[PDB]
């Protein structure tokens, strides 16, 4: 059982899954509407979105007293985010501007990756070592999609038996994708291309929001139960409540370095020879140079105009 990091609107909290009966520790307090949360363990960073302050912020959790730092601002509805701990990038969704965007860990070099055919984008999960990103959209045409972390090769992997796909997580050991649907009340899994789909928890989940994973156990927050639930990732058995009486549970992660497995950054020490952004890519050489929004990449594929 790992530590579980979750957003709670008014704060961010850390609870030990093996001892969830106790009160959670507050990692960050004094927030308005903290929704999405993630981390870069090796950098000692925790990131969150606040939908009321229209921003993504970060804090250094390895400093006795580090302040809240605004990294990205002017985000109308930053409903989901994910940290690329390999390429050192921040990814997020905005369900009001209907966009998916990337930036450096400090918020510099913002680049809009997708801005079309998004209605209610929500959850976003990264597989940095394979250069793929995954997201849900619970809008008029609900779906799960994946694309290169460089904005390449977008395509829909799930578009049936889906309505409110709120939670999304990856199993890096088994190469599987898991998601929770809050209208259809279930958790399903599949291969990373969407094939070989199967049910984990068949039904009876009141309103699951965010989903995470550690070893053989799935963990998720539920808006109606105001709690964190758990079950076996293979059979869906052992369904149990880990941590209860939560003010307003939101996004959640298994908070462990093991959930961010070390790998070689294909960018190297060279930033891939990229003038600006060096993004993870699903195709060799597994990185791709990119530029801030509206800025053109020159003929060499490395230098921004």
């Amino acid at each position: 059982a790992p530590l579980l990091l979750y957003a709670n609107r008014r704060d961010l909290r850390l609870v030990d899954a093996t001892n969830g009966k106790e009160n959670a520790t507050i990692v960050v307090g004094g927030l308005e509407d903290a929704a999405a949360v993630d981390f870069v363990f090796s950098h000692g960073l925790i990131y969150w979105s606040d939908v009321s302050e229209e921003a993504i912020k970060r804090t250094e959790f390895n400093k006795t007293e580090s302040v809240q730092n605004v990294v990205v601002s002017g985000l109308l509805s930053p409903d989901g985010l994910a940290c690329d701990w390999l390429g050192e990038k921040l990814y997020w969704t905005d369900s009001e501007t209907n966009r998916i965007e990337v930036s450096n860990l400090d918020g510099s070099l913002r680049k809009v990756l997708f801005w079309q055919e998004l209605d209610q984008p929500r959850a976003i999960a990264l597989d940095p070592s394979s250069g793929f990103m995954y997201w849900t959209d619970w809008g008029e045409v609900p779906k799960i999609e994946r694309a290169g972390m460089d904005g390449s090769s977008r395509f829909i992997i799930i578009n049936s038996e889906i309505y409110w796909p709120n939670g999304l997580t990856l199993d890096y050991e088994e190469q599987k994708l898991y998601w929770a649907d809050a209208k259809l009340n279930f958790i399903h899994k599949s291969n990373l291309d969407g094939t070989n789909r199967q049910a984990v928890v068949k039904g009876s989940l009141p309103h699951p929001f965010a989903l995470t994973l550690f070893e053989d156990i799935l963990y998720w927050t539920d808006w109606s139960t105001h709690s964190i639930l758990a079950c076996n990732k293979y059979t869906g058995e052992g369904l149990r409540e880990i941590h209860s009486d939560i003010f307003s549970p939101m996004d959640i992660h298994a908070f462990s370095q093991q959930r961010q497995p070390n790998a070689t950054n294909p960018c190297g020490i060279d930033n891939g020879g990229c003038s600006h952004l060096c993004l993870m890519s699903p195709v060799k050489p597994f990185y791709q140079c990119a530029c801030p929004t509206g800025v053109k990449l020159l003929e060499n594929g490395k230098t921004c105009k």
Binding site: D33, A35, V51, S77, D79, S95, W138, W164, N166, A182, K183, H207, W223, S224, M250
Partner: peptide
């Protein structure tokens, strides 16, 4: 149930 984050 409403599924919006803001409400």
């Amino acid at each position: 149930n409403s599924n919006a984050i803001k409400n």
